[PDB]
Amino acid sequence: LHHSEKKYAEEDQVQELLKVLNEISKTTLTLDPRYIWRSLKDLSSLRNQELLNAETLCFTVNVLYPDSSSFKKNLLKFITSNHKSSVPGSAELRNSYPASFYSVNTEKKTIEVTAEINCFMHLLVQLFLWDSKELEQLVEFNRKVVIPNLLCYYNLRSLNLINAKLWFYIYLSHETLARSSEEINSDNQNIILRSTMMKFLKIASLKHDNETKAMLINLILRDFLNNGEVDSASDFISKLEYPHTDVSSSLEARYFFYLSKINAIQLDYSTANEYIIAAIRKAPHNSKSLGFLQQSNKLHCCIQLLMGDIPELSFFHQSNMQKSLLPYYHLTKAVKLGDLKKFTSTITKYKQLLLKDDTYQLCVRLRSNVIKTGIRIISLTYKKISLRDICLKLNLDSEQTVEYMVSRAIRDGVIEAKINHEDGFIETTELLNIYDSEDPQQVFDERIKFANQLHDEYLVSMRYPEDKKTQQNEK
Amino acid sequence: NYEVSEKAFLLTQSKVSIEQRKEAAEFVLAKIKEEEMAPYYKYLCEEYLVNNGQSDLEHDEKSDSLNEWIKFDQELYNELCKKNESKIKELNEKIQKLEEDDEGELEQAQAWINLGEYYAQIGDKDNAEKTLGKSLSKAISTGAKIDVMLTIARLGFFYNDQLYVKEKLEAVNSMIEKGGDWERRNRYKTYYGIHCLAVRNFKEAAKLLVDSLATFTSIELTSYESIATYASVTGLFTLERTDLKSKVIDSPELLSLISTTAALQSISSLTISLYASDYASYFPYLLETYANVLIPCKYLNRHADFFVREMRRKVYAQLLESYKTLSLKSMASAFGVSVAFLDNDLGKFIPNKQLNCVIDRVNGIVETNRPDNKNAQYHLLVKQGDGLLTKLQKYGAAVR
Amino acid sequence: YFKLKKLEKEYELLTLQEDYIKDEQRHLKRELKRAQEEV
Amino acid sequence: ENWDDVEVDDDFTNELKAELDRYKREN
Amino acid sequence: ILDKIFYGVLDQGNGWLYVYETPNQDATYDSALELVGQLNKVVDQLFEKAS
Amino acid sequence: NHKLSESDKKSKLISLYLLNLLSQNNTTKFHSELQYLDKHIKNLEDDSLLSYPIKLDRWLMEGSYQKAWDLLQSGSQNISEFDSFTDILKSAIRDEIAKNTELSYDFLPLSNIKALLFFNNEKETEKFALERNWPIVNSKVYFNNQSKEKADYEDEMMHEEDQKTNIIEKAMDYAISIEN
Amino acid sequence: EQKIQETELKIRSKTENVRRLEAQRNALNDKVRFIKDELRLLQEPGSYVGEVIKIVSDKKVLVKVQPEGKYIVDVAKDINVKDLKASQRVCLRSDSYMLHKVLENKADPLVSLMMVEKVPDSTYDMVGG
């Protein structure tokens, strides 16, 4: 029963291993093994549930174990394993073949097979752990082993993509352990984790690997947000080491998602408004990407309210995600109408929902945006309006309070008006008629630049996928 | 079946003239008993859930209707199933003779045509659409193909189907060659005009409703006074003052409606007050029309008060171009408008750039801004140009 | 060390092929305008 | 639809008749 | 004025007729808006036929 | 996260650090440490020491100086050890109002500006006008709205004179980029 | 090998600057070479127009030219007489007097007046009473 179960899944694993083994042996091809590893995550996740855990036991017995003898026993100890007589030395799939990792030349140490075998061995370990959701000692045991192993290897061009997906599980398993239980050792463990990310990122700068630095920057920028150091994130993004060429669309959307949150506290919403929009277009619309589109759209609605301009309300009702957008619907209504008591009562009941995403602190500063937007609305109504009539519509305190708020927004060019005290009304200084000025000409220049940029980007990849058609013999 | 859907909607939510619910409830009870539809007597329970003026009294004592019992029972249900099983026995007896004969493609399709009418009159929706697809492929010409669309449009107007009905609507239109066919024109312009209602297109609504071939009046779906009802409502948006004195006021089809149906009054009180641009007479006719037109109609009351905001926007633009500087108290004693409530009425437009009115709060006078310029027109190209570049970058990066 | 310097010589060969195609293809535009008008 | 296409106003509905009443009384 | 026979604007307060009527300009908005509107249907047909 | 460190001077020195970034008029690092603390909810609300600088900056950008200036003068907590930052923070409101009256106000009487800037003597108003170069007429002050040389930074963007020449030069460079 | 490893990016970088521009140059050069070589094709006498009537076992097809008389020519080596039948419009070469290829078939109307109408639009619904 259990004998035929281990031979079926192991044969499917070796079949996928021999495909990427011959591709890296001849010259250097990094494109083909990368496309297979994309589907490997989905095929292995479903396969780990079937045929239990016994598919990975004979794989370690097959190939030679540099470090991997005692690591599988520690993984099988937590599950209280019953003895099936799985002791190594029973099943032998090598049988002295060149593609089978010939044993005599391997045992004599005349050839080194450990490079591709050991780096691939650590990949299947983190996949089974993420399926069973194992924590505590098993998480710390892997972090201690992997770090010296990556420092010993020279990390060639093909070797940089093997551990590129392993760093994601290092930071993921550390955050799930802290949120599950808080202790004194969780803080000291994060100190070493910060130094490990920076040492490997600096080494990857010489190799100039596109996917390696893409996964690290996404994990490092998120670490600064949890640890709460802004000065580290400000200088980190100033170097601009993130390549835009071969990185995946899923990795690009995560990059622009962090820049919108960093610039949110810098009081510059001009550049932050573009990063949150570009992150939506780069993120897929599929079901697995719904988790990112849910959090990204919650930030976009908050940025527009911080800009003093009411965004388009059609995004809430037309989308199918409005169930989670209900708290943000009443926030825009309170800022637009300018009701003072409605805004205070909205953030009070929904404070629990806004605590998880940490957007409640930004809602505290929306209290100012309620009045600043209302002043902009009433200013665009009538060019000449009395001073005391403003306090009657918004139910303000006195005329001395509104006098400062109108002259406050004109510093950034918001209201664009003047207050006449001797006359008794506030006259708007905006006559429009910009058709005679040069201001629209500056915007028209940047629009054509976007056209010539896409034309050059159209030339980036055109003939490239067709380059292999001429060299390969056709009919 | 126009009164079937009309009286059923009057029992949903009615805030004006609750006496109409009695004639509506007594009609739907006597209509279902005289027809073969089983489930439409049962649908009264689910369709009226969570609505003002509940027509059902079981656990909810807040029902304001005159007839408070729509409750479904097995006494009427069993009687309607007997008429359904007795009729299908006669049709299956004829269909069995047609299957053994199989004379031409018309008799083979007529078997499904009798079913397409049967499954539509027994209360089946998806089961009727499956029978209409068989008769569509067996039709010998376009004459039997459009009759399939008539049943599709019948079940689509009751359940508000904007997808399957709209797709089959343009399918009969395109086909191979359209031509000047009366059936593919008169019926299409009326039905497609009804689909433009719910989505509020207003571009084709004025052309396909205010302008009709003659009377329409199929009596099966919508009636004569209904087409003229939506014509007065939709004719106040796209049609400007040039067409109001031609296809509205001077239209010969609307001249005999005043002396025929006096319950509408949307082609006289609304048209004369707007053509004369008199706010004094135009104001009291808003609520009189809102009660007897927008509320009873199914495709109107869904929006309702939004139309009041849009219809009042038209008269504000008529007066704005008639003067530059005017006092606020001048229109108060003349057109009968409240000065204190005037700022709140105009406050829903001016900040949204819907109107150019500017009122001075010092001396209490209203001014006029520039109605049109080159700068305001280029702003539409900015939003249209930036919205277009999104698809170029989205579809450009998706294909690689 | 022998194969290390062969990579630098390969870049010189790819540079000569890159500079020739850019100069020849832009020269074909002058010959294309002549060939189309002469025929 | 959104903005005022749905919420509209929800105020001054039945109070429109009170505007003509106060004009014919306080006059 | 409302019938578009003669474009003008009156003044009720001071009783005057202010300068109003001015011509239009084509090939700016209406010609550009209808051109982009037709090109938007072209882009929708590009992605539809690309799959 | 460390829960074993609590003292009366712990929340006191943190509040002093928030007053130092506001004294130098820096909104970058001031908006950072607010959200990032040991407890960013309970300690910034129930505690009046940590919530004191929060209401000062939140009401500063809001534009209400009536209740904001009261905490910097007549406040309870600014008396003993918090009075050091008062000599600066209070001078920030009078600098913002002085820059606001240079645009929206052409001229205003000297009697109102004394109450607007919270001055108890007319000699402080005349002395403050000399530092900002304000011409003084009878019972009034005048604002000419005089700017500085060019604007800001980032040359050839809204900075150097004759910007219409570069726009023409840049517009002529798109035809060359097409051929390239 | 610090300098060699940093220049490894130029392996695929310079490759994209050659193979891509090679196809664009060859496609542009071949268009220039085909136009300059058109003079040899323009001096070609061309071909006549005829119709196929009957065939024999000698690979000799009967071609009837409309302005001229009839000529029995030889089919091309790339084709045969199996695809040829009566009333077929083909292309008859001039200089070599041989068959080139098949153009089209014979139209439905024949002789003097031939009325051909398939699947009319008249149905039973169009005839009332």
Side-chain angles (χ1 to χ4, degrees), chain A residues 51-79:
Chain A
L51 299 176
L52 296 175
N53 57 34
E55 62 184 342
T56 188
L57 189 147
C58 295
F59 178 80
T60 301
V61 177
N62 190 340
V63 296
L64 188 146
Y65 59 94
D67 58 353
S68 64
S69 63
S70 296
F71 296 162
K72 301 300 182 181
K73 294 183 175 74
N74 291 336
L75 188 146
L76 296 175
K77 183 180 293 296
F78 177 80
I79 61 172

mmCIF file of all heavy atoms in Angstrom, chain A residues 51-79:
data_model
loop_
_atom_site.group_PDB
_atom_site.id
_atom_site.type_symbol
_atom_site.label_atom_id
_atom_site.label_comp_id
_atom_site.label_asym_id
_atom_site.label_seq_id
_atom_site.Cartn_x
_atom_site.Cartn_y
_atom_site.Cartn_z
ATOM 1 N N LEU A 51 -0.932 11.695 -0.926
ATOM 2 C CA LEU A 51 0.128 10.737 -0.601
ATOM 3 C C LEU A 51 0.870 11.129 0.675
ATOM 4 O O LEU A 51 2.023 10.740 0.882
ATOM 5 C CB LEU A 51 1.106 10.575 -1.768
ATOM 6 C CG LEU A 51 0.484 10.040 -3.061
ATOM 7 C CD1 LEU A 51 1.502 10.009 -4.192
ATOM 8 C CD2 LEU A 51 -0.132 8.666 -2.844
ATOM 9 N N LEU A 52 0.197 11.896 1.534
ATOM 10 C CA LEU A 52 0.716 12.357 2.818
ATOM 11 C C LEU A 52 2.071 13.044 2.692
ATOM 12 O O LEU A 52 2.322 13.779 1.731
ATOM 13 C CB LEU A 52 0.819 11.182 3.796
ATOM 14 C CG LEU A 52 -0.492 10.502 4.195
ATOM 15 C CD1 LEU A 52 -0.221 9.281 5.064
ATOM 16 C CD2 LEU A 52 -1.411 11.478 4.910
ATOM 17 N N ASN A 53 2.947 12.804 3.665
ATOM 18 C CA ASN A 53 4.271 13.409 3.727
ATOM 19 C C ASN A 53 5.382 12.497 3.222
ATOM 20 O O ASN A 53 6.552 12.889 3.271
ATOM 21 C CB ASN A 53 4.566 13.859 5.163
ATOM 22 C CG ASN A 53 4.463 12.725 6.171
ATOM 23 O OD1 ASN A 53 4.782 11.573 5.877
ATOM 24 N ND2 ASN A 53 3.999 13.052 7.370
ATOM 25 N N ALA A 54 5.053 11.301 2.742
ATOM 26 C CA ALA A 54 6.062 10.293 2.440
ATOM 27 C C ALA A 54 6.740 10.503 1.093
ATOM 28 O O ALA A 54 7.631 9.722 0.742
ATOM 29 C CB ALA A 54 5.437 8.897 2.489
ATOM 30 N N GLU A 55 6.349 11.527 0.332
ATOM 31 C CA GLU A 55 6.984 11.762 -0.960
ATOM 32 C C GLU A 55 8.366 12.385 -0.810
ATOM 33 O O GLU A 55 9.238 12.163 -1.657
ATOM 34 C CB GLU A 55 6.094 12.650 -1.829
ATOM 35 C CG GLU A 55 5.844 14.035 -1.258
ATOM 36 C CD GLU A 55 4.890 14.848 -2.107
ATOM 37 O OE1 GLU A 55 4.687 14.487 -3.285
ATOM 38 O OE2 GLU A 55 4.344 15.848 -1.598
ATOM 39 N N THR A 56 8.586 13.160 0.251
ATOM 40 C CA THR A 56 9.856 13.842 0.456
ATOM 41 C C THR A 56 10.871 13.006 1.224
ATOM 42 O O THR A 56 12.039 13.402 1.305
ATOM 43 C CB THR A 56 9.634 15.167 1.196
ATOM 44 O OG1 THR A 56 10.860 15.906 1.235
ATOM 45 C CG2 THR A 56 9.156 14.910 2.617
ATOM 46 N N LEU A 57 10.462 11.868 1.786
ATOM 47 C CA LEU A 57 11.394 11.047 2.552
ATOM 48 C C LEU A 57 12.355 10.305 1.631
ATOM 49 O O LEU A 57 13.573 10.323 1.843
ATOM 50 C CB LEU A 57 10.621 10.069 3.439
ATOM 51 C CG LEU A 57 11.405 9.255 4.474
ATOM 52 C CD1 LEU A 57 10.547 9.009 5.704
ATOM 53 C CD2 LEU A 57 11.888 7.931 3.896
ATOM 54 N N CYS A 58 11.825 9.646 0.599
ATOM 55 C CA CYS A 58 12.674 8.890 -0.315
ATOM 56 C C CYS A 58 13.482 9.791 -1.239
ATOM 57 O O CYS A 58 14.493 9.344 -1.789
ATOM 58 C CB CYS A 58 11.829 7.920 -1.140
ATOM 59 S SG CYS A 58 11.038 6.616 -0.173
ATOM 60 N N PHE A 59 13.058 11.044 -1.427
ATOM 61 C CA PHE A 59 13.843 11.969 -2.237
ATOM 62 C C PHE A 59 15.174 12.286 -1.567
ATOM 63 O O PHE A 59 16.198 12.431 -2.245
ATOM 64 C CB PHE A 59 13.047 13.249 -2.493
ATOM 65 C CG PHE A 59 13.801 14.288 -3.275
ATOM 66 C CD1 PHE A 59 13.908 14.195 -4.653
ATOM 67 C CD2 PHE A 59 14.398 15.361 -2.632
ATOM 68 C CE1 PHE A 59 14.600 15.149 -5.375
ATOM 69 C CE2 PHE A 59 15.091 16.318 -3.348
ATOM 70 C CZ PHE A 59 15.192 16.212 -4.721
ATOM 71 N N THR A 60 15.178 12.397 -0.237
ATOM 72 C CA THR A 60 16.427 12.604 0.486
ATOM 73 C C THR A 60 17.286 11.345 0.478
ATOM 74 O O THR A 60 18.519 11.435 0.461
ATOM 75 C CB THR A 60 16.131 13.046 1.921
ATOM 76 O OG1 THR A 60 15.372 14.261 1.897
ATOM 77 C CG2 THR A 60 17.421 13.287 2.695
ATOM 78 N N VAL A 61 16.656 10.169 0.476
ATOM 79 C CA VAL A 61 17.410 8.919 0.440
ATOM 80 C C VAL A 61 18.058 8.725 -0.926
ATOM 81 O O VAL A 61 19.193 8.243 -1.025
ATOM 82 C CB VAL A 61 16.492 7.738 0.806
ATOM 83 C CG1 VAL A 61 17.241 6.418 0.693
ATOM 84 C CG2 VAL A 61 15.922 7.921 2.206
ATOM 85 N N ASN A 62 17.352 9.095 -1.994
ATOM 86 C CA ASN A 62 17.849 8.949 -3.358
ATOM 87 C C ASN A 62 19.162 9.702 -3.538
ATOM 88 O O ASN A 62 20.219 9.088 -3.716
ATOM 89 C CB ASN A 62 16.796 9.445 -4.356
ATOM 90 C CG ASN A 62 17.134 9.097 -5.799
ATOM 91 O OD1 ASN A 62 18.284 8.823 -6.138
ATOM 92 N ND2 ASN A 62 16.121 9.106 -6.657
ATOM 93 N N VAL A 63 19.105 11.031 -3.493
ATOM 94 C CA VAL A 63 20.304 11.844 -3.652
ATOM 95 C C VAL A 63 21.146 11.784 -2.382
ATOM 96 O O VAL A 63 20.667 11.446 -1.296
ATOM 97 C CB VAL A 63 19.943 13.294 -4.014
ATOM 98 C CG1 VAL A 63 19.245 13.344 -5.364
ATOM 99 C CG2 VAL A 63 19.067 13.906 -2.933
ATOM 100 N N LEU A 64 22.429 12.110 -2.527
ATOM 101 C CA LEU A 64 23.325 12.145 -1.379
ATOM 102 C C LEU A 64 22.981 13.333 -0.489
ATOM 103 O O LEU A 64 22.603 14.401 -0.978
ATOM 104 C CB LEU A 64 24.780 12.220 -1.843
ATOM 105 C CG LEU A 64 25.890 12.069 -0.797
ATOM 106 C CD1 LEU A 64 27.092 11.366 -1.406
ATOM 107 C CD2 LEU A 64 26.308 13.418 -0.229
ATOM 108 N N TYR A 65 23.108 13.140 0.823
ATOM 109 C CA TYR A 65 22.743 14.170 1.786
ATOM 110 C C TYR A 65 23.999 14.882 2.275
ATOM 111 O O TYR A 65 24.826 14.257 2.957
ATOM 112 C CB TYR A 65 21.974 13.555 2.956
ATOM 113 C CG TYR A 65 22.704 12.478 3.742
ATOM 114 C CD1 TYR A 65 23.418 12.787 4.894
ATOM 115 C CD2 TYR A 65 22.684 11.154 3.325
ATOM 116 C CE1 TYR A 65 24.086 11.813 5.608
ATOM 117 C CE2 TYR A 65 23.350 10.171 4.034
ATOM 118 C CZ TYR A 65 24.049 10.507 5.175
ATOM 119 O OH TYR A 65 24.715 9.535 5.887
ATOM 120 N N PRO A 66 24.244 16.130 1.884
ATOM 121 C CA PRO A 66 25.305 16.882 2.565
ATOM 122 C C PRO A 66 24.943 17.248 3.999
ATOM 123 O O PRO A 66 25.642 16.862 4.939
ATOM 124 C CB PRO A 66 25.468 18.127 1.683
ATOM 125 C CG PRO A 66 24.136 18.299 1.025
ATOM 126 C CD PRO A 66 23.603 16.909 0.810
ATOM 127 N N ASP A 67 23.848 17.995 4.175
ATOM 128 C CA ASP A 67 23.321 18.334 5.492
ATOM 129 C C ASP A 67 21.997 17.666 5.852
ATOM 130 O O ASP A 67 21.545 17.820 6.990
ATOM 131 C CB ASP A 67 23.165 19.857 5.613
ATOM 132 C CG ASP A 67 22.249 20.440 4.553
ATOM 133 O OD1 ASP A 67 21.831 19.692 3.643
ATOM 134 O OD2 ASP A 67 21.946 21.649 4.629
ATOM 135 N N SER A 68 21.366 16.936 4.934
ATOM 136 C CA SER A 68 19.919 16.740 4.992
ATOM 137 C C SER A 68 19.482 15.468 5.716
ATOM 138 O O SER A 68 18.285 15.160 5.713
ATOM 139 C CB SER A 68 19.325 16.766 3.580
ATOM 140 O OG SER A 68 19.793 15.688 2.794
ATOM 141 N N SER A 69 20.403 14.720 6.325
ATOM 142 C CA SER A 69 19.996 13.512 7.039
ATOM 143 C C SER A 69 19.193 13.849 8.289
ATOM 144 O O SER A 69 18.077 13.350 8.477
ATOM 145 C CB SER A 69 21.219 12.675 7.411
ATOM 146 O OG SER A 69 22.065 13.379 8.302
ATOM 147 N N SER A 70 19.743 14.699 9.157
ATOM 148 C CA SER A 70 19.105 14.993 10.433
ATOM 149 C C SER A 70 17.987 16.020 10.318
ATOM 150 O O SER A 70 17.221 16.190 11.272
ATOM 151 C CB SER A 70 20.148 15.484 11.440
ATOM 152 O OG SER A 70 21.095 14.470 11.726
ATOM 153 N N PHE A 71 17.873 16.703 9.178
ATOM 154 C CA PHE A 71 16.840 17.722 9.032
ATOM 155 C C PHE A 71 15.464 17.113 8.800
ATOM 156 O O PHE A 71 14.462 17.664 9.268
ATOM 157 C CB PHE A 71 17.192 18.673 7.886
ATOM 158 C CG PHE A 71 18.446 19.468 8.120
ATOM 159 C CD1 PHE A 71 19.103 20.075 7.065
ATOM 160 C CD2 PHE A 71 18.965 19.611 9.397
ATOM 161 C CE1 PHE A 71 20.253 20.808 7.278
ATOM 162 C CE2 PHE A 71 20.117 20.339 9.616
ATOM 163 C CZ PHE A 71 20.762 20.938 8.555
ATOM 164 N N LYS A 72 15.393 15.987 8.088
ATOM 165 C CA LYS A 72 14.104 15.343 7.861
ATOM 166 C C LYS A 72 13.600 14.639 9.115
ATOM 167 O O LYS A 72 12.386 14.559 9.331
ATOM 168 C CB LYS A 72 14.206 14.356 6.699
ATOM 169 C CG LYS A 72 14.646 14.994 5.393
ATOM 170 C CD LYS A 72 13.665 16.067 4.953
ATOM 171 C CE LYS A 72 14.066 16.674 3.620
ATOM 172 N NZ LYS A 72 13.120 17.740 3.191
ATOM 173 N N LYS A 73 14.509 14.129 9.949
ATOM 174 C CA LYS A 73 14.089 13.486 11.190
ATOM 175 C C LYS A 73 13.504 14.501 12.163
ATOM 176 O O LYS A 73 12.574 14.188 12.915
ATOM 177 C CB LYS A 73 15.269 12.750 11.826
ATOM 178 C CG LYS A 73 15.765 11.563 11.017
ATOM 179 C CD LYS A 73 16.878 10.825 11.742
ATOM 180 C CE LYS A 73 17.280 9.564 10.995
ATOM 181 N NZ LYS A 73 18.068 9.872 9.771
ATOM 182 N N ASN A 74 14.038 15.726 12.164
ATOM 183 C CA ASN A 74 13.479 16.770 13.015
ATOM 184 C C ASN A 74 12.101 17.196 12.527
ATOM 185 O O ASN A 74 11.241 17.575 13.330
ATOM 186 C CB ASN A 74 14.428 17.967 13.069
ATOM 187 C CG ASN A 74 15.704 17.666 13.829
ATOM 188 O OD1 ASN A 74 15.743 16.768 14.670
ATOM 189 N ND2 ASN A 74 16.759 18.416 13.534
ATOM 190 N N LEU A 75 11.874 17.145 11.213
ATOM 191 C CA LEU A 75 10.557 17.467 10.677
ATOM 192 C C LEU A 75 9.554 16.356 10.960
ATOM 193 O O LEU A 75 8.363 16.630 11.147
ATOM 194 C CB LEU A 75 10.659 17.739 9.174
ATOM 195 C CG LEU A 75 9.434 18.282 8.431
ATOM 196 C CD1 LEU A 75 9.875 19.213 7.314
ATOM 197 C CD2 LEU A 75 8.582 17.155 7.863
ATOM 198 N N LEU A 76 10.012 15.104 10.996
ATOM 199 C CA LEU A 76 9.137 13.974 11.278
ATOM 200 C C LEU A 76 8.961 13.715 12.768
ATOM 201 O O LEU A 76 8.123 12.886 13.140
ATOM 202 C CB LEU A 76 9.675 12.711 10.600
ATOM 203 C CG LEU A 76 9.712 12.718 9.070
ATOM 204 C CD1 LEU A 76 10.387 11.460 8.545
ATOM 205 C CD2 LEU A 76 8.310 12.858 8.496
ATOM 206 N N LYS A 77 9.725 14.394 13.625
ATOM 207 C CA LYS A 77 9.595 14.194 15.064
ATOM 208 C C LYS A 77 8.393 14.934 15.639
ATOM 209 O O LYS A 77 7.747 14.432 16.564
ATOM 210 C CB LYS A 77 10.876 14.642 15.771
ATOM 211 C CG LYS A 77 10.878 14.409 17.274
ATOM 212 C CD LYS A 77 12.178 14.884 17.902
ATOM 213 C CE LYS A 77 13.355 14.037 17.444
ATOM 214 N NZ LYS A 77 13.235 12.625 17.901
ATOM 215 N N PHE A 78 8.079 16.116 15.103
ATOM 216 C CA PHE A 78 6.967 16.907 15.620
ATOM 217 C C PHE A 78 5.613 16.270 15.333
ATOM 218 O O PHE A 78 4.653 16.530 16.065
ATOM 219 C CB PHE A 78 7.021 18.320 15.030
ATOM 220 C CG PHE A 78 5.878 19.201 15.449
ATOM 221 C CD1 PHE A 78 5.881 19.820 16.687
ATOM 222 C CD2 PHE A 78 4.808 19.419 14.597
ATOM 223 C CE1 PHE A 78 4.831 20.633 17.074
ATOM 224 C CE2 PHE A 78 3.755 20.232 14.976
ATOM 225 C CZ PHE A 78 3.767 20.840 16.217
ATOM 226 N N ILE A 79 5.516 15.438 14.297
ATOM 227 C CA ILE A 79 4.241 14.856 13.892
ATOM 228 C C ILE A 79 4.043 13.502 14.561
ATOM 229 O O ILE A 79 3.033 12.827 14.323
ATOM 230 C CB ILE A 79 4.159 14.725 12.360
ATOM 231 C CG1 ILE A 79 5.272 13.810 11.851
ATOM 232 C CG2 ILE A 79 4.242 16.094 11.701
ATOM 233 C CD1 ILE A 79 5.160 13.468 10.388
#
